[model samples]
Structure formats: structure tokens, C-alpha cells
Target: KVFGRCELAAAMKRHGLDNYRGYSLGNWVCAAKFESNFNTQATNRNTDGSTDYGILQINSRWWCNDGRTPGSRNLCNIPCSALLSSDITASVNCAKKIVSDGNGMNAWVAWRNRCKGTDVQAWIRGCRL
Candidate 1:
């Protein structure tokens, strides 16, 4: 299930991203591990009373018509959420499109750079990014 819903795997396969010495699954895995703690079905409440749900930790602000209300517009019209529909891989892939599209690969590349340090995994575990 993790592999099927994994953006790193999808991007690797889709973009032939297999050539690597240390950064093979670097950035993509960082995003997933940081965002959802590998939980495809994760959902949590925000201080605004709306929710950040699913993989990639997409906030209700991205889709919400009401800031504090859950399941209002937050339920519909998410570019990634529409395709993913609780599928973490789909959400990650969709987020990749948004990120890579506007910012190119550097956004992920930058994120990956921070995550590749010696204590990256430990730092990531403590963070709720």
C-alpha cells in the first residue's frame, strides 16, 4: 500500500529517477515521511479549527470555503485530493505537479537537501512538517 501510494516511487518510475548514489529516494520520501508520518489516512485539526488531512498534510485552507469549518469546501475541488481521494500516492503525485510545476524541481531539491543531513531522519521525526 505504501509503495502504491508513494510519490517518490511514482516519480522515480515516471521520470526514470533511478540513477543515484545516496539521493535515490531522498526528497520524495522526505516529503511523505514529514507530512503524513507515512499515514495515508491521517487527519488532524489545526488551530483555525479546520483540518489538515491525508498525505501531504493538505490544509482545509486550500479547499475550504469556510476557514474554521470542516468538510465544507474542504471536501471538494482539491487538485490533488480529487485524484487521490484518500490515496496517499495520488496526493503526493498531485502535489508534485503543483510544486514541480511552478517551482521546478528545486523546491523538492531544496527540501531534500535539508533532509539529507546526518540527523535528518531524527529531525524530521520531531517535526510536524
Candidate 2:
């Protein structure tokens, strides 16, 4: 379940997801789809100082760390890594916070009203995620 839609849905639900299910999922999906195609191992270039990587485009190298290496939430063994921790609550909440902070998808309601109406694919294309 953690590898497919069920995991995502569970991840969303545990974090108090609201309206992004049927429609909001597209926003989250599109971001992951465009960012890394849902690759849990995805990583953006570090040359420009962008420290993002893995599914949901988590900037793990900056958020969570291990030993001396700046690891990402997706792979780090801290409280956020998808590989080392089952902190689904933290994971979901963090994603919601990031999305809402950036584009106002804080809740499912917002996604339906503002973002859902937009073309997800085109929107992703615009960002070139």
C-alpha cells in the first residue's frame, strides 16, 4: 500500500487532507509527476543551491540531516524519511504545509476552488518541475 495510491491516500488522510482527493490529488500528483514522476529517489541539481529530492519533491537535504551528510526527508533516517521512519503524520503534514505555503493548497477546499480548475499538466509544465 505504501508504494501505490493507497499509501498516498492514507498519507493524505492521516495528515488531515481536505479537498485534494479527487481534484487536489492532481496537484500533488502533478507536482510529483512533473518533478520526479513519483520517484522516491529523485533529486534536483545542487549547483544552484536548490536542495530538493525524492517523491513529493521534498527538499530533504535541507530539512532533515544525518551525521554530517545533509540528507533529505525521503532518505534520511531522521523523523521524516520515508525509508527509515513511519512518521506518516509528519510526512503528510509537512507536504500540506509546503503546498499551502507555496500555492495555497493548504486544504483540499483550496485546491478544488483555485488549483483544480487549472490544467494540472500545463501548470506543471509552466513550472518545469
Candidate 3:
């Protein structure tokens, strides 16, 4: 499912992700934009043959099962396809778990490469909610 920035922001807020797990809403928004542009169906295969899923791009290796990535830790214990839905409760919960794992947003390469040190507030500039 496709979501506009405002819609996405609202959903995140509803899921307690606006300031979830000690990370600012701006951080989440920035990561989402760089990761999948709020596209729930987005998936990308890495050069290492692992794939990332959903707006947050949680990986197949540690977070979810894609049926292709063997030995998946399945830390979230949810199907990878579940992340690729408009109902992002599972994704948000998984993300919170991931952040709480002590890596913070460091798990996401997009956050490190595109969001780190950037003015993340811009990601929620017009989303009044």
C-alpha cells in the first residue's frame, strides 16, 4: 500500500511510533523516506542475497522469514510479507523490538547513509499530526 507523508505520519503516531522506543518521530520519518518512501510493498535484494522488507526495510537475515534466506533468526517472529501491508502494526512492533536490541537505528543502512546527521525534521515538515 502507498501512503502519503501525512498519512504515514498519522499511522506511526497511532502505533506510538511518533516518539517510539526513545527515537524521535523525525528519525522514523527520515528512515522511512529513505528506506521505501512509505511503500509497504517495497522490497529490495542486497548484493549479499539478503532482502529488505517494507517501509523500514527490515532484513530477512535477522528479522523476518522470506523463505529464501535460510537460517533466518526470525527475531520478530512474523512473516516478512506481513511487513508489506498497510496495516503496519507488526512492522512497528518489530521495529521497536529492533531498536530496543541496542543497535538503535544502526540496523538500517539507509538511516546511516541518508538520515544520519541530516535535518530529519524535514521529513515531517507538513504533517501536522
Candidate 4:
């Protein structure tokens, strides 16, 4: 499912991503914008043989178990397929887990490149909270 910018923001908010970890709703929304353009079914295969799954781009190398990565940590303890669901519960939960232990939201390369120290407010422009 391809989500509109506002639509994605609202969903993330409902899941308590708004400032959940010193990261704003805009921050979460911005990351998703660059990661998969809000595409729930998005997947990207990395050269390391680990794949990123779903909108938040959780990686098999360290997050979810895809059963294909050479050595998946599956720290989130979830199947990669769960991340692809439009419900977004698993993705948001897993994303929170990733940030809770890392350098915060910068864990995602997309956020580091596109959202970090950037005007993430633009990600939520005109969207009613």
C-alpha cells in the first residue's frame, strides 16, 4: 500500500511514533519518505545479502528474520514478512526497538541522509496532528 504523506503521518502518530524517542512525527514520516516513499510492500536487497523489508526498511542483517540472510540476528524477533503488512504494528514496533539501542533514529541510513538535522517539518507540512 502506498500511503500519502499525511496518511502516513497520522498512522505513525496513532502508533505513538510522535516524539516517542526524541524523534518527532516529522522525523518518522521523513524517514519513510526516503526509505520507501511510503510503500508498505517496499523491499530492497543489500549487497551484503541482507534485505530491507517494508516501509520502515527493517533489515534482515540485524532486525528481522527473513530466513535468507546469511546470519540474521532477528533482534526484533519477527518475520520479515510481518513488516510488509499494511497494519504497520510490527514495523513501528520493530523500528522503536532499533532506535532504543542505537544512535537513535539515525539507525536508518535514509534518515541519516534525508532526515537527520534536516527540516523534517516539511515532512508533515499542512498535516493536522
| Model 4 residue 86 CA deviation in Å | 1.0
Task: Pick the winner on TM-score between candidates 2 and 3.
Answer: 3
List per-prediction Cα lDDT, in the order shown.
0.48, 0.46, 0.87, 0.90
lDDT tens readout by residue for model 4, 1-129: 999999999999999999997898899999998999899999999999899999989999889998899888989889999899889899988988889985998788999987898888998989985
lDDT of 4 at 105: 81
Residues 1-129 of candidate 3 have per-residue lDDT tens digits of: 888987888788888877676677888988888899889999999887889999899999999998999789999998999999988898999999988888788888889998888888888888875
How would you order the candidates by lDDT, starting with the best? 4, 3, 1, 2
lDDT of 3: 0.87
- Candidate with maximal lDDT: 4
34-82, model 1: which lDDT tens digit per residue?
A: 6566556666777777666655556566543434564555434454234
Better candidate number, 1 or 3, judged by TM-score? 3
Q: Whole-model lDDT for model 1 versus the true structure?
A: 0.48
TM-score, one value per model: 0.48, 0.48, 0.93, 0.96
Name the runs in model 2 displaced over 4 angstroms.
1-23, 60-62, 66-90, 102-117, 121-129
